[PDB]
Structure 1
Amino acid sequence: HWGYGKHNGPEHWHKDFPIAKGERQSPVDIDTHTAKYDPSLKPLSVSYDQATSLRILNNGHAFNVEFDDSQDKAVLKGGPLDGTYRLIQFHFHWGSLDGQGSEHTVDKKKYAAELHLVHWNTKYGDFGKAVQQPDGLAVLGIFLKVGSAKPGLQKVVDVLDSIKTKGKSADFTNFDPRGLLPESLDYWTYPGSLTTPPLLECVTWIVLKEPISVSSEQVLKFRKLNFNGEGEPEELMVDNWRPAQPLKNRQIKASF
């Protein structure tokens, strides 16, 4: 039943997922004046050159672009991380208007949307084992602002038509996620959680400083997707973001 509506929204998740009120919930507001540079942070290694995308799926709250994670084809290493983390999927969160949609905020600023590249710690063997551990997952988060089109995104935008409703999927091979990165890999990092139920506290968040630009036309096509299944009454897929959660006992570090 969970979702983003008035009766099943984030305000309600704690009832079925008590960890929602936990000590290391995501997302959070990034107070730039309180984040601290950490010169001990090693440089971030994004190695997506052999990434193998497979499929795109409308899961009822967003769409996932899924990848083959049977081997070390696309990985995240270095930065705050120990070991190797394999890309399993990416998705977005976006708003009903350009003034909202991101999950993380920067000095309370909300971007139009946010891209999450989800990776799991290969020493745990699979994703399911990984989300039983405090260092199981690493998510690369990238803000989207509305401006010029992102060429690298257009392929995704153009398949949306075919996965309009919940549980629809389409073939999605040969997509290169490198085309969704900004120039700079400067980041902020903190320990957190999934921002969707079950809200497991297993994530090392790495949030890039530099947003990517996407066109209004591109984001408009995101807002034409549906939460609902086929034949059901249309509920447009918008505002599928969880607001900022309390930082509690956590420090956000800057790589720059």
Structure 2
Amino acid sequence: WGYGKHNGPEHWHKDFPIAKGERQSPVDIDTHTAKYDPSLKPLSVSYDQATSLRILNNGHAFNVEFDDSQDKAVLKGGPLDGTYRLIQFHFHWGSLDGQGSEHTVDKKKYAAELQLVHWNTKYGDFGKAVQQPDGLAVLGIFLKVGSAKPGLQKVVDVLDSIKTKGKSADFTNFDPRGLLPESLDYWTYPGSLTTPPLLECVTWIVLKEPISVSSEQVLKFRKLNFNGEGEPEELMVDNWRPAQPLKNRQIKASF
């Protein structure tokens, strides 16, 4: 599977039937239909003790991985119950500035989307969390092209070293707190992973406020390869999945 003409998201359902499921992501967020639920608690992002460990090009995106052996970087509160541990973050971007995000707001696509992935600790490990309806909490953050995001630059400079699929580089002491927008207002709805196995185990938390990055910054993402070293070069761009039917779901807004 991939994002090309013959192995794209429209073919996924053949190897993964859940792709036509009842709670697939991403979805379009209709700001006028989202329900303000005054019972949603604020979000608690505790990323101070975060231990980043490595950056890896997995052929579909680049993943920055964190040590999840203890409650170092967690997320709780909001619509969640229990403590969700951060395991990795990655992005989805376009070949152009008008597209790249997975979620969209009133049909507006963004230049890219940051997804911070966390698993419910009650389940012991990541492998077991994905098999539960409330196993994952994914924090989605929109990126628009404007002024540079200083905090993101350390990530941008290491990309040259993980150009092709299968490559990784040690990536310690990265502080993910520098990627958060100023506000923590969000929309939330029950959903799924956006790449195969496309499991419906995710509580999505999409932040209202996007962060800006510079054109020079996103352009660096576009120099990545889906291919492995020594294979024909295929640029890693447009690795995003299109919106899926909302169906029997309600999108709640914390504001």
Cα deviation per residue 1:150-195 (whole Å; 9 max; x = unaligned)? Answer: 0010000000000000000000000000000000000000000000
Give the CA deviation at 1:253.
Answer: 0.2
Q: Which residue of 2 aligns with 1:22?
A: 21
> Shift in Å at residue 97 of structure 1?
0.1
Question: Deviation at 1:11?
Answer: 0.2
Q: CA RMSD in A?
A: 0.3
Match of 1:144 in 2: 143
After superposition, the C-alpha distances for 1:39-85 in whole angstroms (9 at most, x for unaligned) are 00011000000000000000001000000000000000000000000
For these two proteins, the number of residue pairs brought into alignment is: 255
Q: Which residue of 2 aligns with 1:133?
A: 132
Partner of 1:58: 57
- Post-superposition Cα deviations, 1:91-145, rounded to whole Å, max 9, x if no partner, equal 0000000000000000000000000000000000000000110000000000000
Instruction: Give the Å deviation of 1:4.
Output: 0.2
**TM-superposed deviation, 1:211:** 0.2
Task: Could you tell me which runs of 5 or more consecutive residues in structure 2 were left unpaired when the two chains were aligned.
Answer: none
Distance in structure 2 (CA, Å) of the matches to 1:191 and 1:152: 30
Structure 1, residues 174-222: CA drift from partner, whole Å, max 9, x if none? 0000000000000000000000001000000000000000000000000
Q: In structure 2, what is the Cα distance between the partners aligned to 1:22 and 1:104?
A: 17
Task: Write the distance in 2 (CA, Å) between the matches of 1:152 and 1:188.
Answer: 24
- Distance in 2 (CA, whole Å) between partners of 1:83 and 1:3 is 34
For residues 5 and 39 of structure 2, what CA distance do their matches in structure 1 show?
44
Task: Determine what percentage of the aligned residue pairs are the same residue.
Answer: 100
Task: Please give the residue correspondences for 1:99-138 in structure 2 after superposition, counting only pairs within 5 Å.
Answer: 99-138=98-137
Secondary structure at 1:218 match in 2: helix
Deviation at residue 244 of structure 1 after TM alignment: 0.2
Q: Secondary structure at the match of 1:162?
A: helix
Shift of residue 231, structure 1, vs aligned partner: 0.6
- TM-score, scaled to structure 2: 1.00
SS for the counterpart of 1:139 is strand
Q: Structure 1 length as normaliser, TM-score? A: 0.99
Q: Deviations over 1:214-254 (max 9, x none)?
A: 00000000000000000111100000000000001000000
Runs of 4+ that moved beyond 2 A: none
Find out whether 1:170 has 2:164 as its counterpart. no
Question: Within 2, Cα distance between the matches of 1:148 and 1:10?
Answer: 32
Identify unmatched segments of 5+ residues in structure 1: none
SS in structure 2 at match of 1:9: coil
| Cα distance in 2, alignment partners of residues 229 and 31 from structure 1 | 39
CA drift of 1:9 comes to 0.3
